[PDB]
Amino acid sequence: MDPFGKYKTVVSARAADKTILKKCQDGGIVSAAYIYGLENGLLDGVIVADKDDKLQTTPKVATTVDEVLEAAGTKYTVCPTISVIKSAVREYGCEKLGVVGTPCQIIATRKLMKYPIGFRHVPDKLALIVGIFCMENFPYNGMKTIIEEHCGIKMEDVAKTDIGKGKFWVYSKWGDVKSIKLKETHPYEQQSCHVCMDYTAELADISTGSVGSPDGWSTVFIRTAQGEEFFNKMVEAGALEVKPIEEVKPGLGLVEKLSLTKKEKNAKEIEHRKEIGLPVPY
């Protein structure tokens, strides 16, 4: 079956602005695309996922670069970014809106556009749909057990979390680092993710993630014309460092591996549900 869906080109890239790299999760692609639209009149508002002192998430409509930098970094917990999409074009008055979301959130945006029943004036103002890769997500209390009880670090002392090398990582405000085997986190994951058939956010203008690229770099799929124009304006302005994915290691094969592993697994779950009488999307 198709591994990555349709796309135009795949590269490995990172932001040129060094400040962004200091705060971002991987290559800083989402923050670098948001800061460029905002500063060069391609975006007047971007949807982000912010956190408080305890890592609790809040979807928000940002309009300044500093708002973008604060929202940089991954929160491995559920954050409804699309719940503010109408707010963004209503009271906030945006007309060139940037959207970010996990694959399922990007699917909800395409559904939103094709059948905009309760979305008057919303589809025409979506200027950049950025998707981030995703394998699983977690309820907040699910991640809280993982961090505080399995990694032994309080939420208020977490500076950054990262998933990689069959291990989940917690970096502390005070220099400490702790990692646990990724199989100790499974029972805490949102079970509705077990029917998700999208790993690389195949329906986005631009998709980005860490798998396939080294630390500090992001593997980015360019998919639609809208995302192509944006990206090309960025590299021409020197906003990004780009290397062809064919040279950097591990490379695209690791993406294909994981993308098919997710699809083959959750495919069985969909058929299992159909078997015992439970509804699935169609």
């Binding site: 309820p139 907040y140 209390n141 699910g142 809280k144 057990t145 029972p187 805490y188 994951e189 949102q190 079970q191 015992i276 009488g277 439970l278």
Partner: peptide
């Protein structure tokens, strides 16, 4: 709808007829 430990993942409850 969940959110309650100690089983943060427990959030789906259906009548027996659904299965």
């Amino acid at each position: 709808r969940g959110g309650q430990m100690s089983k943060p993942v427990h959030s789906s409850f259906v009548p027996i007829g659904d299965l």
